[PDB]
Amino acid sequence: AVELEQLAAYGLTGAYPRTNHSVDTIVKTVNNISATYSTIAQMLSTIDLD
Amino acid sequence: PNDEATIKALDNVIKQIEALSVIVNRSEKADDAQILGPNTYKQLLEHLFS
């Protein structure tokens, strides 16, 4: 949800997203997410699943 | 998955289950009876004539 004035100001100046990081950091973060889900998944499968 | 979290979870679960299965219930209450100490009768005043 955005307000009309903010969107109009964004479109008038022709802004674009920009970044300074590399691609490896984001894929490392995604791998961290997957690892933290898999840890709990196997803990449940080895302790609670019944 | 990290194999150092499952071991910790298993340790916690085992320790908790074992701490739950040691506590015992035992009471030492007395009975509602009494002591019934000794007593003697006492005579009321009387008047006698003939």
Tell me which method was used to determine the 3D structure: cryo-EM
Resolution value, angstrom units: 3.7
Chain A environment of B12 (Cβ under 8 Å): none
Chain A environment of B5 (Cβ under 8 Å): 39, 43
CA distance A7 to A2: 7
Joined tokens for residue B18: 């074992």
Q: DSSP letters along A1-50, please?
A: ---HHHHHHHHHHT--------HHHHHHHHHHHHHHHHHHHHHHHHHT--
CA distance B6 to chain A (A): 5
Closest CA to A47 of B7, B21, B16: B7
Can you say whether the dihedral through the CA atoms of A34, A40, A46, B1 is positive or negative?
positive
The answer to whether A47 and B13 have CB atoms below 8 angstroms apart is yes
Q: Which of A37, A47, A49 to mutate to test the interface with B (most CBs of B within 10 A)?
A: A47
The answer to whether B1 and A42 have CB atoms below 8 angstroms apart is yes
